[PDB]
Amino acid sequence: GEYPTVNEIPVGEVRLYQIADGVWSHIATQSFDGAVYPSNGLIVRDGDELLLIDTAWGAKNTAALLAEIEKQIGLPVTRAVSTHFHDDRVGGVDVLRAAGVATYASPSTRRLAEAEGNEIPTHSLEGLSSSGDAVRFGPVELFYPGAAHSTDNLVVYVPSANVLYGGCAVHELSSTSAGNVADADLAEWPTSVERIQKHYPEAEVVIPGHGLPGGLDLLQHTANVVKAHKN
Ligand SMILES: C[C@H](Oc1ccc(CN)cc1)c1cccc2c(-c3ccc(CS(C)(=O)=O)c(F)c3)c(C(=O)O)[nH]c12
Ligand SMILES: [Zn+2]
Ligand SMILES: [Zn+2]
């Protein structure tokens, strides 16, 4: 019942965590440049179907995610959104697409994924190209806060439950560093976080791209660690 960590997640298996009624996170682990990392995604019930947010970081992890969803929830995943272009968000899109899931991302994410050699979601999400933009997608709202962890990062809000999924633009409270910042805009990131804070002041659960969910404090903490990283 505690939030899963790598010490309970061998690379290749996936765990789900119930966040609220009809909202789960998914947690998987992956190795990258010789270190092991956890990463989160989201599952949101969409009537008798499910909307998936982000892959489980890899083809085999994403196959394991689909099997875990079938075991624990038993409703079909019909659509998936990837919230930026890195492999913890799109790696596994080919698995999803061969399992009949329609895969979506912003045009910016699709272009960056293609240029990087990462898997490419099929469908483009328009209406998200300017910071502050929001669109509805099934039971969620997608929001583009501006450049942060990456120039294309999206956040996801579940209005029925006041769940804010920040993705990799939001870090967990225990973080001491701003993660992998190679594609980040450290100067713009606090402004983008401020936009999230202004847009979703009633969020009750905030889920980072990696690590433990918490409350709204994750947003200010993220701004703090980014500003200190920059400096
Ligand atoms: C999936 C991502 O791939 C790449 C990212 C950039 C590039 C540049 N061409 C190439 C590959 C990736 C690969 C490996 C690690 C990461 C991390 C990361 C790193 C450290 C922490 C602990 S912390 C906040 O306390 O420092 C953390 F939570 C997350 C993140 C993220 O920050 O989103 N992305 C990661
Ligand atoms: Zn990333
Ligand atoms: Zn990440």
PDB file of C-alpha atoms and ligand atoms in Angstrom:
ATOM      1  CA  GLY A   1       0.000   0.000   0.000  1.00  0.00           C
ATOM      2  CA  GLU A   2       2.939   2.416   0.203  1.00  0.00           C
ATOM      3  CA  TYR A   3       3.948   4.261  -2.976  1.00  0.00           C
ATOM      4  CA  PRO A   4       6.171   1.814  -4.939  1.00  0.00           C
ATOM      5  CA  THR A   5       9.876   2.443  -5.368  1.00  0.00           C
ATOM      6  CA  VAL A   6      12.654   0.675  -7.278  1.00  0.00           C
ATOM      7  CA  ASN A   7      13.328  -1.501  -4.244  1.00  0.00           C
ATOM      8  CA  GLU A   8       9.952  -3.049  -4.970  1.00  0.00           C
ATOM      9  CA  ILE A   9      10.242  -2.677  -8.745  1.00  0.00           C
ATOM     10  CA  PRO A  10      12.694  -4.789 -10.679  1.00  0.00           C
ATOM     11  CA  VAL A  11      13.248  -3.425 -14.144  1.00  0.00           C
ATOM     12  CA  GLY A  12      10.569  -5.064 -16.317  1.00  0.00           C
ATOM     13  CA  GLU A  13       7.599  -5.218 -13.918  1.00  0.00           C
ATOM     14  CA  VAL A  14       5.038  -2.504 -13.328  1.00  0.00           C
ATOM     15  CA  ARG A  15       2.981  -1.505 -10.319  1.00  0.00           C
ATOM     16  CA  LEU A  16      -0.183   0.576 -10.141  1.00  0.00           C
ATOM     17  CA  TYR A  17      -1.163   2.896  -7.289  1.00  0.00           C
ATOM     18  CA  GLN A  18      -4.685   4.133  -6.711  1.00  0.00           C
ATOM     19  CA  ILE A  19      -4.616   7.923  -6.485  1.00  0.00           C
ATOM     20  CA  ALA A  20      -8.356   8.664  -6.424  1.00  0.00           C
ATOM     21  CA  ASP A  21     -11.592   7.216  -7.747  1.00  0.00           C
ATOM     22  CA  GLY A  22     -10.844   6.283 -11.349  1.00  0.00           C
ATOM     23  CA  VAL A  23      -7.249   7.601 -11.224  1.00  0.00           C
ATOM     24  CA  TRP A  24      -4.114   5.465 -10.868  1.00  0.00           C
ATOM     25  CA  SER A  25      -0.453   6.098 -11.349  1.00  0.00           C
ATOM     26  CA  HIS A  26       1.775   3.513 -12.952  1.00  0.00           C
ATOM     27  CA  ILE A  27       5.352   2.994 -11.764  1.00  0.00           C
ATOM     28  CA  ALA A  28       8.151   1.188 -13.561  1.00  0.00           C
ATOM     29  CA  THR A  29      11.914   1.163 -13.458  1.00  0.00           C
ATOM     30  CA  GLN A  30      14.527   1.453 -16.148  1.00  0.00           C
ATOM     31  CA  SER A  31      18.258   1.626 -16.535  1.00  0.00           C
ATOM     32  CA  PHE A  32      19.864   4.531 -18.352  1.00  0.00           C
ATOM     33  CA  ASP A  33      23.609   5.211 -18.629  1.00  0.00           C
ATOM     34  CA  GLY A  34      24.270   2.577 -15.986  1.00  0.00           C
ATOM     35  CA  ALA A  35      21.918   3.815 -13.277  1.00  0.00           C
ATOM     36  CA  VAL A  36      18.399   2.682 -12.355  1.00  0.00           C
ATOM     37  CA  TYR A  37      15.499   5.081 -12.114  1.00  0.00           C
ATOM     38  CA  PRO A  38      11.773   4.922 -11.347  1.00  0.00           C
ATOM     39  CA  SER A  39       9.251   6.770 -13.452  1.00  0.00           C
ATOM     40  CA  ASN A  40       5.536   7.485 -13.219  1.00  0.00           C
ATOM     41  CA  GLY A  41       2.602   7.684 -15.595  1.00  0.00           C
ATOM     42  CA  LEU A  42      -1.149   8.037 -15.172  1.00  0.00           C
ATOM     43  CA  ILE A  43      -4.270   5.981 -15.911  1.00  0.00           C
ATOM     44  CA  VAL A  44      -7.689   7.667 -15.911  1.00  0.00           C
ATOM     45  CA  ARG A  45     -10.995   5.877 -16.248  1.00  0.00           C
ATOM     46  CA  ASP A  46     -12.948   7.115 -19.301  1.00  0.00           C
ATOM     47  CA  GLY A  47     -16.344   5.441 -18.834  1.00  0.00           C
ATOM     48  CA  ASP A  48     -15.753   1.769 -19.652  1.00  0.00           C
ATOM     49  CA  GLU A  49     -12.378   2.538 -21.268  1.00  0.00           C
ATOM     50  CA  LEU A  50      -9.074   3.900 -19.967  1.00  0.00           C
ATOM     51  CA  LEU A  51      -6.905   6.836 -20.986  1.00  0.00           C
ATOM     52  CA  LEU A  52      -3.199   6.271 -20.461  1.00  0.00           C
ATOM     53  CA  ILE A  53      -0.751   9.108 -19.820  1.00  0.00           C
ATOM     54  CA  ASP A  54       2.845   8.187 -20.733  1.00  0.00           C
ATOM     55  CA  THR A  55       4.464   4.847 -21.430  1.00  0.00           C
ATOM     56  CA  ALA A  56       6.293   2.833 -18.770  1.00  0.00           C
ATOM     57  CA  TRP A  57       9.749   3.703 -20.235  1.00  0.00           C
ATOM     58  CA  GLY A  58      10.485   0.956 -22.700  1.00  0.00           C
ATOM     59  CA  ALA A  59       8.841  -1.637 -24.888  1.00  0.00           C
ATOM     60  CA  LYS A  60       8.957  -4.519 -22.415  1.00  0.00           C
ATOM     61  CA  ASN A  61       7.948  -2.297 -19.495  1.00  0.00           C
ATOM     62  CA  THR A  62       4.982  -1.023 -21.533  1.00  0.00           C
ATOM     63  CA  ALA A  63       3.886  -4.566 -22.416  1.00  0.00           C
ATOM     64  CA  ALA A  64       4.073  -5.321 -18.677  1.00  0.00           C
ATOM     65  CA  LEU A  65       2.018  -2.176 -18.005  1.00  0.00           C
ATOM     66  CA  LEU A  66      -0.783  -3.367 -20.270  1.00  0.00           C
ATOM     67  CA  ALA A  67      -0.761  -6.759 -18.545  1.00  0.00           C
ATOM     68  CA  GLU A  68      -0.860  -5.133 -15.109  1.00  0.00           C
ATOM     69  CA  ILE A  69      -3.799  -2.941 -16.165  1.00  0.00           C
ATOM     70  CA  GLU A  70      -5.675  -6.017 -17.380  1.00  0.00           C
ATOM     71  CA  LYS A  71      -5.018  -7.796 -14.089  1.00  0.00           C
ATOM     72  CA  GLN A  72      -5.839  -4.894 -11.766  1.00  0.00           C
ATOM     73  CA  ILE A  73      -8.476  -2.880 -13.662  1.00  0.00           C
ATOM     74  CA  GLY A  74      -9.741  -4.968 -16.545  1.00  0.00           C
ATOM     75  CA  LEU A  75     -10.868  -2.161 -18.853  1.00  0.00           C
ATOM     76  CA  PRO A  76      -9.278  -1.559 -22.265  1.00  0.00           C
ATOM     77  CA  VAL A  77      -6.743   1.174 -22.818  1.00  0.00           C
ATOM     78  CA  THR A  78      -8.039   2.958 -25.901  1.00  0.00           C
ATOM     79  CA  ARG A  79      -5.949   6.144 -26.053  1.00  0.00           C
ATOM     80  CA  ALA A  80      -2.592   7.310 -24.769  1.00  0.00           C
ATOM     81  CA  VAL A  81      -1.016  10.766 -24.510  1.00  0.00           C
ATOM     82  CA  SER A  82       2.746  11.266 -24.161  1.00  0.00           C
ATOM     83  CA  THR A  83       3.640  14.411 -22.263  1.00  0.00           C
ATOM     84  CA  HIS A  84       7.079  14.997 -23.846  1.00  0.00           C
ATOM     85  CA  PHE A  85       9.499  13.362 -26.237  1.00  0.00           C
ATOM     86  CA  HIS A  86      11.873  11.451 -23.939  1.00  0.00           C
ATOM     87  CA  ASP A  87      11.889   7.643 -23.739  1.00  0.00           C
ATOM     88  CA  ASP A  88      10.189   7.622 -20.318  1.00  0.00           C
ATOM     89  CA  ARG A  89       7.143   9.103 -22.102  1.00  0.00           C
ATOM     90  CA  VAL A  90       7.194   7.648 -25.654  1.00  0.00           C
ATOM     91  CA  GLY A  91       9.313   4.529 -25.283  1.00  0.00           C
ATOM     92  CA  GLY A  92       6.685   1.842 -25.684  1.00  0.00           C
ATOM     93  CA  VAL A  93       4.446   3.760 -28.104  1.00  0.00           C
ATOM     94  CA  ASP A  94       5.097   1.062 -30.740  1.00  0.00           C
ATOM     95  CA  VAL A  95       3.890  -1.582 -28.254  1.00  0.00           C
ATOM     96  CA  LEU A  96       0.781   0.502 -27.526  1.00  0.00           C
ATOM     97  CA  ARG A  97       0.097   1.022 -31.236  1.00  0.00           C
ATOM     98  CA  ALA A  98       0.347  -2.735 -31.909  1.00  0.00           C
ATOM     99  CA  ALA A  99      -2.066  -3.371 -29.018  1.00  0.00           C
ATOM    100  CA  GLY A 100      -4.694  -1.154 -30.670  1.00  0.00           C
ATOM    101  CA  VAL A 101      -4.130   1.950 -28.515  1.00  0.00           C
ATOM    102  CA  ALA A 102      -4.400   5.266 -30.358  1.00  0.00           C
ATOM    103  CA  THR A 103      -1.316   7.327 -29.406  1.00  0.00           C
ATOM    104  CA  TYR A 104      -1.248  11.110 -29.217  1.00  0.00           C
ATOM    105  CA  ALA A 105       1.211  13.924 -28.485  1.00  0.00           C
ATOM    106  CA  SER A 106       1.644  17.559 -29.381  1.00  0.00           C
ATOM    107  CA  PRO A 107       3.229  18.337 -32.759  1.00  0.00           C
ATOM    108  CA  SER A 108       6.217  19.670 -30.851  1.00  0.00           C
ATOM    109  CA  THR A 109       6.681  16.339 -29.056  1.00  0.00           C
ATOM    110  CA  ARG A 110       6.234  14.404 -32.291  1.00  0.00           C
ATOM    111  CA  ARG A 111       8.889  16.479 -34.079  1.00  0.00           C
ATOM    112  CA  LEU A 112      11.359  16.175 -31.195  1.00  0.00           C
ATOM    113  CA  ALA A 113      10.791  12.439 -30.856  1.00  0.00           C
ATOM    114  CA  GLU A 114      11.335  11.957 -34.594  1.00  0.00           C
ATOM    115  CA  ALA A 115      14.532  14.034 -34.595  1.00  0.00           C
ATOM    116  CA  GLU A 116      15.904  12.151 -31.556  1.00  0.00           C
ATOM    117  CA  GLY A 117      15.131   8.680 -32.882  1.00  0.00           C
ATOM    118  CA  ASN A 118      12.481   7.974 -30.236  1.00  0.00           C
ATOM    119  CA  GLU A 119       9.129   6.315 -30.887  1.00  0.00           C
ATOM    120  CA  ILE A 120       6.563   8.650 -32.395  1.00  0.00           C
ATOM    121  CA  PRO A 121       2.906   8.930 -31.307  1.00  0.00           C
ATOM    122  CA  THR A 122       0.506   8.691 -34.238  1.00  0.00           C
ATOM    123  CA  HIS A 123      -1.824  11.652 -33.681  1.00  0.00           C
ATOM    124  CA  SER A 124      -1.070  15.343 -33.181  1.00  0.00           C
ATOM    125  CA  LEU A 125      -2.664  17.346 -30.376  1.00  0.00           C
ATOM    126  CA  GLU A 126      -3.361  20.855 -31.674  1.00  0.00           C
ATOM    127  CA  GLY A 127      -4.313  23.782 -29.519  1.00  0.00           C
ATOM    128  CA  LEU A 128      -1.353  23.496 -27.132  1.00  0.00           C
ATOM    129  CA  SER A 129       1.381  25.500 -28.861  1.00  0.00           C
ATOM    130  CA  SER A 130       1.287  28.666 -26.694  1.00  0.00           C
ATOM    131  CA  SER A 131       2.063  28.698 -22.973  1.00  0.00           C
ATOM    132  CA  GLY A 132      -1.168  28.752 -20.992  1.00  0.00           C
ATOM    133  CA  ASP A 133      -3.057  26.750 -23.628  1.00  0.00           C
ATOM    134  CA  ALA A 134      -5.424  24.034 -22.476  1.00  0.00           C
ATOM    135  CA  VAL A 135      -7.543  21.439 -24.269  1.00  0.00           C
ATOM    136  CA  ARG A 136      -9.884  18.699 -23.116  1.00  0.00           C
ATOM    137  CA  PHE A 137      -9.012  15.068 -23.863  1.00  0.00           C
ATOM    138  CA  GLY A 138     -11.502  12.575 -22.478  1.00  0.00           C
ATOM    139  CA  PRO A 139     -11.617  12.861 -18.694  1.00  0.00           C
ATOM    140  CA  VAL A 140      -8.572  15.155 -18.453  1.00  0.00           C
ATOM    141  CA  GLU A 141      -7.404  18.609 -19.377  1.00  0.00           C
ATOM    142  CA  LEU A 142      -4.034  18.917 -21.088  1.00  0.00           C
ATOM    143  CA  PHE A 143      -2.109  22.105 -20.322  1.00  0.00           C
ATOM    144  CA  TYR A 144       1.056  23.510 -21.855  1.00  0.00           C
ATOM    145  CA  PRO A 145       2.769  25.574 -19.124  1.00  0.00           C
ATOM    146  CA  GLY A 146       5.739  26.727 -21.176  1.00  0.00           C
ATOM    147  CA  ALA A 147       9.251  25.369 -21.392  1.00  0.00           C
ATOM    148  CA  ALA A 148      10.529  23.660 -18.240  1.00  0.00           C
ATOM    149  CA  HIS A 149      12.060  20.177 -18.128  1.00  0.00           C
ATOM    150  CA  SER A 150      11.703  20.265 -21.944  1.00  0.00           C
ATOM    151  CA  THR A 151      10.280  22.775 -24.407  1.00  0.00           C
ATOM    152  CA  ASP A 152       7.320  20.469 -25.173  1.00  0.00           C
ATOM    153  CA  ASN A 153       6.317  19.283 -21.690  1.00  0.00           C
ATOM    154  CA  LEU A 154       2.605  18.998 -21.005  1.00  0.00           C
ATOM    155  CA  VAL A 155       0.829  18.644 -17.693  1.00  0.00           C
ATOM    156  CA  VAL A 156      -2.455  16.845 -17.125  1.00  0.00           C
ATOM    157  CA  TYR A 157      -5.298  17.685 -14.765  1.00  0.00           C
ATOM    158  CA  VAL A 158      -8.105  15.315 -13.761  1.00  0.00           C
ATOM    159  CA  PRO A 159     -10.936  17.689 -12.772  1.00  0.00           C
ATOM    160  CA  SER A 160     -13.147  15.012 -11.212  1.00  0.00           C
ATOM    161  CA  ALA A 161     -10.476  14.330  -8.602  1.00  0.00           C
ATOM    162  CA  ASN A 162      -8.368  17.505  -8.532  1.00  0.00           C
ATOM    163  CA  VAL A 163      -5.344  15.434  -9.523  1.00  0.00           C
ATOM    164  CA  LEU A 164      -2.454  17.324 -11.141  1.00  0.00           C
ATOM    165  CA  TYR A 165      -0.016  15.149 -13.050  1.00  0.00           C
ATOM    166  CA  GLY A 166       2.998  17.360 -13.574  1.00  0.00           C
ATOM    167  CA  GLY A 167       5.141  14.949 -15.504  1.00  0.00           C
ATOM    168  CA  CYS A 168       8.821  15.711 -15.625  1.00  0.00           C
ATOM    169  CA  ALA A 169       8.269  19.463 -15.159  1.00  0.00           C
ATOM    170  CA  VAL A 170       7.485  18.630 -11.513  1.00  0.00           C
ATOM    171  CA  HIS A 171       9.886  16.950  -9.079  1.00  0.00           C
ATOM    172  CA  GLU A 172       9.229  15.061  -5.896  1.00  0.00           C
ATOM    173  CA  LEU A 173       9.781  16.684  -2.516  1.00  0.00           C
ATOM    174  CA  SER A 174      12.858  14.606  -1.660  1.00  0.00           C
ATOM    175  CA  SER A 175      14.693  15.753  -4.788  1.00  0.00           C
ATOM    176  CA  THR A 176      17.916  17.704  -4.339  1.00  0.00           C
ATOM    177  CA  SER A 177      18.653  18.291  -8.024  1.00  0.00           C
ATOM    178  CA  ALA A 178      16.524  19.112 -11.039  1.00  0.00           C
ATOM    179  CA  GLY A 179      16.935  15.683 -12.680  1.00  0.00           C
ATOM    180  CA  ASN A 180      18.038  15.357 -16.292  1.00  0.00           C
ATOM    181  CA  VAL A 181      18.171  18.961 -17.478  1.00  0.00           C
ATOM    182  CA  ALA A 182      19.869  18.420 -20.833  1.00  0.00           C
ATOM    183  CA  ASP A 183      16.756  19.552 -22.733  1.00  0.00           C
ATOM    184  CA  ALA A 184      15.456  21.976 -20.082  1.00  0.00           C
ATOM    185  CA  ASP A 185      15.018  25.737 -19.973  1.00  0.00           C
ATOM    186  CA  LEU A 186      16.123  26.488 -16.411  1.00  0.00           C
ATOM    187  CA  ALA A 187      15.455  30.223 -16.743  1.00  0.00           C
ATOM    188  CA  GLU A 188      11.866  29.705 -17.949  1.00  0.00           C
ATOM    189  CA  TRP A 189      11.035  26.719 -15.715  1.00  0.00           C
ATOM    190  CA  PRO A 190       9.996  28.734 -12.604  1.00  0.00           C
ATOM    191  CA  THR A 191       7.709  30.894 -14.777  1.00  0.00           C
ATOM    192  CA  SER A 192       6.156  27.760 -16.232  1.00  0.00           C
ATOM    193  CA  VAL A 193       5.664  26.347 -12.729  1.00  0.00           C
ATOM    194  CA  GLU A 194       4.064  29.640 -11.684  1.00  0.00           C
ATOM    195  CA  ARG A 195       1.622  29.220 -14.581  1.00  0.00           C
ATOM    196  CA  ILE A 196       0.716  25.738 -13.328  1.00  0.00           C
ATOM    197  CA  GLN A 197       0.178  27.092  -9.801  1.00  0.00           C
ATOM    198  CA  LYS A 198      -2.069  29.855 -11.113  1.00  0.00           C
ATOM    199  CA  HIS A 199      -4.103  27.560 -13.336  1.00  0.00           C
ATOM    200  CA  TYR A 200      -4.655  24.675 -10.871  1.00  0.00           C
ATOM    201  CA  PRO A 201      -4.903  26.235  -7.391  1.00  0.00           C
ATOM    202  CA  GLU A 202      -7.328  23.563  -6.218  1.00  0.00           C
ATOM    203  CA  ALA A 203      -5.094  20.593  -6.998  1.00  0.00           C
ATOM    204  CA  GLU A 204      -5.163  18.109  -4.126  1.00  0.00           C
ATOM    205  CA  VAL A 205      -2.644  15.526  -5.359  1.00  0.00           C
ATOM    206  CA  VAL A 206       0.412  16.459  -7.432  1.00  0.00           C
ATOM    207  CA  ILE A 207       2.236  13.619  -9.213  1.00  0.00           C
ATOM    208  CA  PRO A 208       5.828  14.175 -10.419  1.00  0.00           C
ATOM    209  CA  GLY A 209       7.335  12.487 -13.454  1.00  0.00           C
ATOM    210  CA  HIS A 210       9.621  10.508 -11.144  1.00  0.00           C
ATOM    211  CA  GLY A 211       9.128   9.764  -7.440  1.00  0.00           C
ATOM    212  CA  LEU A 212       6.466  10.206  -4.794  1.00  0.00           C
ATOM    213  CA  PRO A 213       3.197  12.132  -5.192  1.00  0.00           C
ATOM    214  CA  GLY A 214       2.356  14.842  -2.697  1.00  0.00           C
ATOM    215  CA  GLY A 215       0.443  18.088  -2.564  1.00  0.00           C
ATOM    216  CA  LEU A 216       0.833  21.529  -4.098  1.00  0.00           C
ATOM    217  CA  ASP A 217       4.197  21.950  -2.298  1.00  0.00           C
ATOM    218  CA  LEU A 218       5.824  19.921  -5.081  1.00  0.00           C
ATOM    219  CA  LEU A 219       5.395  22.920  -7.372  1.00  0.00           C
ATOM    220  CA  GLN A 220       7.249  25.427  -5.194  1.00  0.00           C
ATOM    221  CA  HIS A 221       9.860  22.800  -4.313  1.00  0.00           C
ATOM    222  CA  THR A 222      10.477  22.211  -8.019  1.00  0.00           C
ATOM    223  CA  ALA A 223      10.942  25.928  -8.646  1.00  0.00           C
ATOM    224  CA  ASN A 224      13.362  26.055  -5.714  1.00  0.00           C
ATOM    225  CA  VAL A 225      15.539  23.153  -6.868  1.00  0.00           C
ATOM    226  CA  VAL A 226      15.605  24.419 -10.457  1.00  0.00           C
ATOM    227  CA  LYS A 227      16.614  27.950  -9.424  1.00  0.00           C
ATOM    228  CA  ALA A 228      19.436  26.546  -7.289  1.00  0.00           C
ATOM    229  CA  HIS A 229      20.545  24.179 -10.062  1.00  0.00           C
ATOM    230  CA  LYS A 230      20.739  27.109 -12.491  1.00  0.00           C
ATOM    231  CA  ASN A 231      22.805  29.008  -9.916  1.00  0.00           C
TER     232      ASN A 231
HETATM  233  C1  LIG B   1      14.245   9.619 -19.889  1.00  0.00           C
HETATM  234  C2  LIG B   1      15.450  10.604 -19.827  1.00  0.00           C
HETATM  235  O1  LIG B   1      16.180  10.352 -20.973  1.00  0.00           O
HETATM  236  C3  LIG B   1      16.916  11.418 -21.527  1.00  0.00           C
HETATM  237  C4  LIG B   1      16.781  12.752 -21.150  1.00  0.00           C
HETATM  238  C5  LIG B   1      17.573  13.717 -21.749  1.00  0.00           C
HETATM  239  C6  LIG B   1      18.489  13.359 -22.717  1.00  0.00           C
HETATM  240  C7  LIG B   1      19.353  14.443 -23.371  1.00  0.00           C
HETATM  241  N1  LIG B   1      19.696  14.101 -24.736  1.00  0.00           N
HETATM  242  C8  LIG B   1      18.627  12.040 -23.100  1.00  0.00           C
HETATM  243  C9  LIG B   1      17.839  11.074 -22.500  1.00  0.00           C
HETATM  244  C10 LIG B   1      16.153  10.349 -18.481  1.00  0.00           C
HETATM  245  C11 LIG B   1      17.109   9.354 -18.307  1.00  0.00           C
HETATM  246  C12 LIG B   1      17.691   9.156 -17.041  1.00  0.00           C
HETATM  247  C13 LIG B   1      17.314   9.908 -15.934  1.00  0.00           C
HETATM  248  C14 LIG B   1      16.340  10.919 -16.103  1.00  0.00           C
HETATM  249  C15 LIG B   1      15.748  11.861 -15.235  1.00  0.00           C
HETATM  250  C16 LIG B   1      16.008  12.006 -13.744  1.00  0.00           C
HETATM  251  C17 LIG B   1      17.267  12.057 -13.207  1.00  0.00           C
HETATM  252  C18 LIG B   1      17.418  12.152 -11.836  1.00  0.00           C
HETATM  253  C19 LIG B   1      16.332  12.184 -10.975  1.00  0.00           C
HETATM  254  C20 LIG B   1      16.552  12.281  -9.467  1.00  0.00           C
HETATM  255  S1  LIG B   1      16.648  13.999  -8.875  1.00  0.00           S
HETATM  256  C21 LIG B   1      15.181  14.868  -9.474  1.00  0.00           C
HETATM  257  O2  LIG B   1      16.664  14.106  -7.417  1.00  0.00           O
HETATM  258  O3  LIG B   1      17.894  14.629  -9.323  1.00  0.00           O
HETATM  259  C22 LIG B   1      15.053  12.104 -11.514  1.00  0.00           C
HETATM  260  F1  LIG B   1      13.927  12.122 -10.732  1.00  0.00           F
HETATM  261  C23 LIG B   1      14.903  12.009 -12.892  1.00  0.00           C
HETATM  262  C24 LIG B   1      14.828  12.559 -16.004  1.00  0.00           C
HETATM  263  C25 LIG B   1      13.962  13.708 -15.607  1.00  0.00           C
HETATM  264  O4  LIG B   1      14.517  14.585 -14.868  1.00  0.00           O
HETATM  265  O5  LIG B   1      12.804  13.841 -16.082  1.00  0.00           O
HETATM  266  N2  LIG B   1      14.865  12.105 -17.246  1.00  0.00           N
HETATM  267  C26 LIG B   1      15.774  11.115 -17.355  1.00  0.00           C
HETATM  268 ZN    ZN B   2      12.197  14.044 -19.859  1.00  0.00          ZN
HETATM  269 ZN    ZN B   3      11.510  12.299 -16.925  1.00  0.00          ZN
END
